[PDB]
């Protein structure tokens, strides 16, 4: 009740956390090629301002 619970709390959170965050990466990418390519120009505009990329 402590040894297989409150030691089963912290490390099986890690697998559930990654499986939560592996679910937000594929299921939001179901086609819609209009929505792909507007995000690639977001990548090419954020690279100008943000950092040492022009200096």
């Amino acid at each position: 009740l402590l040894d297989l619970i409150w030691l089963e709390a912290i490390l099986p959170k890690t697998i559930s956390l990654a499986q939560m965050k592996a679910s937000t990466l594929v299921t939001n990418q179901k086609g819609l090629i209009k929505l792909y390519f507007l995000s690639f120009l977001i990548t090419i505009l954020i690279s100008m301002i943000l950092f040492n990329f022009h200096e």
């Binding site: 040894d3 297989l4 030691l7 089963e8 490390l11």
Partner: protein
């Protein structure tokens, strides 16, 4: 090892090359012939040190440790034949070869001469043991326990490559433990703390702590056929000796932060003993015992200053024979009752009177009967940590009191009446059941005659 790995690799093109059922009697026959060659060229003298040949062997000079590594392969083949003989011959021979391959990396290991060959051999295991858990095991929930058998040892061991190459490019070269004469001291910083941290934490993955040890009653609970690689998993846990190699030098003076490793392994020591008096599994029963007085040795090392290296040399092999023998008791009484749950075993001691002697002397090695190899080292752990302070005898002494109940808690379970059942479990302890049950105490009390070889530098 001039030619020790050399004869045993030739044993491998002999399994599938051989005939039919002759493969068991042939494999055991060759195997004991190497055991004399182990004894002969070793055990030499002896005064600092025996650098063996070259860059691949330092001859295990300070701690011999290697005789115990070679009993087990001509000891488990007679054990694994209990329930294995149901498959194809080519599939059964593969199960023979992978266990023999397990010994060859561990033959080069424990001597290893170096540190960059150490880690590749420190990680050369876990490949054959994992396959044994996957195929030809027991019932389900194997595969998660195979994943818990990974993802801890590999999780902690990867900063060693972060540590060691950081030493190799900084001060000299770690090929030679004996070219470690010049060692700079290590002061308290915020960078050097992590340098000691990665140097130590990977060794706590194998010999367990009160933390991070949930995987250990999975491989021993969900286990192969009848304690087959479980006996090898005993040497796999005690074989984390390399802290003796490393932290003897290479930041010795950081003891200001030794305390949370002293304390956590001490209240967790007294706790995990009592965490199994209400356990309902036999193979889990010895498993939590194998945590407690294996966690005894850790405070013998981080506390330096010998009269602590004396007993800690002997306490590695203490349960290493004992818990291997207890698993041989637990591998038996399962081919006859096909469930490992201890409560169903009421009404013993009358059908099997011959092995009833073997229950007595085995559990008499936990009470441990002070002229043995067990209470000869635990008195030196007393002799060390009482010089630390006067409080340390309290929590360590109750460990000698809880396992007094916890061992006889198993013995009394054999004595009951009328047994209610069991038109099966007829077999009155055949030759394989008791000859394999021997050869454990038979060298153990033999080593208690002149226990001079079981001693470190020290």
């Amino acid at each position: 090892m001039l030619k020790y790995i050399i004869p045993t690799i030739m044993l491998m093109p002999l399994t599938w090359l051989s005939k039919n059922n002759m493969i068991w009697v042939n494999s055991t026959a060759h195997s004991l012939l190497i055991s004399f060659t182990s004894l002969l060229l070793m055990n030499q003298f002896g005064d600092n040190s025996l650098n063996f040949s070259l860059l691949f062997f330092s001859d295990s000079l300070s701690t011999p440790l290697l005789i115990l590594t070679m009993w087990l392969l001509p000891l488990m083949l007679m054990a694994s034949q209990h329930h294995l003989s149901k498959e194809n011959l080519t599939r059964k021979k593969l199960f023979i070869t992978m266990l023999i391959s397990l010994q060859l990396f561990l033959i080069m290991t424990f001597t290893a001469m170096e540190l960059i060959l150490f880690y590749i051999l420190f990680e050369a295991t876990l490949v054959p043991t994992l396959i044994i858990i996957t195929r030809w095991g027991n019932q389900t929930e194997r595969l998660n326990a195979g994943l818990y058998f990974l993802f801890y040892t590999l999780a902690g061991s990867l900063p060693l490559l972060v540590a060691l190459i950081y030493i190799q490019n900084t001060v000299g070269s770690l090929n030679f433990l004996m070219l470690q004469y010049w060692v700079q001291p290590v002061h308290n910083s915020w960078s050097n703390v992590f340098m000691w941290l990665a140097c130590m934490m990977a060794f706590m993955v194998k010999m367990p702590l009160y933390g991070l040890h949930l995987w250990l009653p999975k491989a021993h609970v969900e286990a192969p056929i009848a304690g087959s690689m479980v006996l090898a998993a005993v040497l796999l846990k005690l074989g984390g000796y390399g802290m003796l190699r490393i932290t003897l030098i290479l930041n010795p003076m950081t003891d200001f932060m030794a305390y949370p490793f002293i304390m956590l392994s001490l209240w967790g020591m007294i706790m995990t003993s009592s965490i199994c008096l209400r356990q309902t599994d036999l193979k889990s029963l010895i498993a939590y015992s194998s945590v407690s007085h294996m966690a005894l040795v850790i405070v013998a090392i981080l506390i330096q200053t010998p009269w602590s290296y004396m007993g800690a040399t002997a306490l590695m092999i203490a349960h290493g024979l004992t818990s291997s023998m207890l698993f041989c008791l637990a591998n038996s009484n399962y081919e006859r009752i096909h469930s490992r749950t201890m409560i169903l075993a009421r009404g013993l001691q009358t059908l099997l009177p011959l092995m009833a002697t073997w229950w007595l002397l085995a559990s008499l090695t936990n009470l441990a009967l002070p002229p043995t190899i067990n209470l000869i080292g635990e008195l030196f752990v007393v002799m060390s940590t009482f010089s630390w302070s006067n409080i340390t005898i309290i929590l360590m002494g109750v460990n000698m009191v809880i396992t007094a109940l916890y061992s006889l808690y198993m013995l009394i379970m054999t004595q009951r009446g009328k047994y209610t059942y069991h038109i099966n479990n007829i077999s009155p302890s055949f030759t394989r059941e008791n000859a394999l049950m021997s050869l454990h105490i038979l060298p153990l009390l033999l080593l208690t005659l002149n226990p001079k070889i079981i001693l470190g530098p020290l």
